[PDB]
Amino acid sequence: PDQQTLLHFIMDSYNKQRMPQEITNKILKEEFSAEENFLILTEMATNHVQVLVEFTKKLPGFQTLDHEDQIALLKGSAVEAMFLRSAEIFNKKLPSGHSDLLEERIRNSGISDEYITPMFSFYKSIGELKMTQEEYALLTAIVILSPDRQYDREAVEKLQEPLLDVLQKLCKIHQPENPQHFAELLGRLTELRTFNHHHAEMLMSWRVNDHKFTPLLEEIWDV
């Protein structure tokens, strides 16, 4: 724990920005139909992007980075960060996530079976890791600060590696019996990358069937 203080304000940041209960109540409260399911998912996503931006801002030395690479990182990690947060809802059964009803809506929102299947297979796998909130938080931070996104890569690594080290330590400090556990997590990140292509195809399908998104989502996903 040489300087685990950075973990302090990361969890502070991770708990800081939150989805309003009035908005997440719609997952439970509203009609269940293909159209309403899609609209609720779109509202959740566009709200979560704003939560994401506020989390990213608070990250160590994010604001000191190059301005246009900051956009490149936000755009590159958006889908992956939403998959991770949604995974956390399903895995921990976050009350305000209403996971069983969230699942009903995802399974009837115009998404192909081809994408539903690996989506929920991913959710189950990540759940079986039995991760803590600090793991979810650090993985999210690591995912956001990826040096290999399209469009200097070096200064991103300076911000990311410290977080990878803290995650590396917490595995050896909270799972001593499995020293393949850190590797396990990193493997699931590669599985997470798989959903970038899936999501681009999902957007195409939705668009040709006359679905529109929000200005914010349209910007961050290049719609």
Binding site: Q50, V53, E54, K57, Q63, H67, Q70, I71, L74, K75, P215, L216, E219, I220
Partner: peptide
Amino acid sequence: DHQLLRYLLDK
């Protein structure tokens, strides 16, 4: 080019 993201970052 990415006005809304800039706006959220600067707010």
